[PDB]
């Protein structure tokens, strides 16, 4: 696979930014910080028993962030491969 | 062998303006002068800007 060097450079920069930002988001989501609450796919029933459930959904979103950061890692490697290929 | 000679003259005319620019400050000086080129050794806005 091949593409123009400028597009490949855009790819690498985009991938790096994605990795960093989503690492930050996953870190804070796994910390369960309140700041990100509204992004949690919480359900009304959960606010009865205790906060452990919302912790686990926080972690679900955190894992999901880490996964997307992984896809960005693969994309970054891919785009770097193309950049050096050109 | 005949020499060159340089003469001063007490001048009522307005001189040009200069600000001893450097790489870092060049953009800022350009920006502050864009609305108008400063006058003779008047306060330069660049350093504080």
């Amino acid at each position: 696979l091949c593409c123009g060097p400028k597009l490949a450079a855009c790819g690498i920069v985009l991938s790096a930014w994605g990795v960093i930002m989503l690492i930050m988001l996953g870190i804070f989501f796994n910390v369960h910080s309140a700041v990100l609450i509204e992004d949690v796919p919480f359900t009304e029933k959960d606010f009865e028993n205790g906060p452990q459930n919302i912790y686990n959904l926080y972690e679900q979103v955190s894992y999901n962030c880490f996964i997307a950061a992984g896809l960005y890692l693969l994309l970054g490697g891919f785009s770097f491969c193309q950049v050096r290929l050109n | 062998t005949v020499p060159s000679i340089l003469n001063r003259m007490q001048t009522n005319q307005t001189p040009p303006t200069y600000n001893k620019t450097n790489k870092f400050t060049h953009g800022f000086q350009n920006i502050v002068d864009a609305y108008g080129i400063g006058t003779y050794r008047e306060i330069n806005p660049a350093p504080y800007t």
Binding site: A34, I37, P51, I54 | N22, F24, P47
Partner: protein, 80 residues
């Protein structure tokens, strides 16, 4: 939660004051001396005033934040 309006003001006031007052005495001689000392002083002034205004905005708060019952329920566990 020990967020006094005593220690933060001293720490940050002395921080920016050092930057804006003592640093100019340590900057070496040079052509860029003027812009450098100006940078130090103006940075100290501006940043210190910015942070000061921001914190005094919270000193003696007049009205409280309004929060969804969801977040109130969650924070009751989460925060001090």
């Amino acid at each position: 939660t020990a967020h006094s309006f005593a220690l933060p003001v001293i720490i940050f006031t002395t921080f920016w004051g050092l930057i804006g007052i003592a640093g100019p005495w340590f900057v070496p001689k040079g052509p860029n001396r003027g812009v450098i000392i100006t940078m130090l002083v103006a940075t100290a002034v501006c940043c210190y005033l910015f942070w000061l205004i921001a914190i005094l905005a919270q000193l003696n708060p007049l009205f409280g934040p309004q929060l969804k019952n969801e977040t109130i329920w969650y924070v009751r566990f989460l925060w001090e």
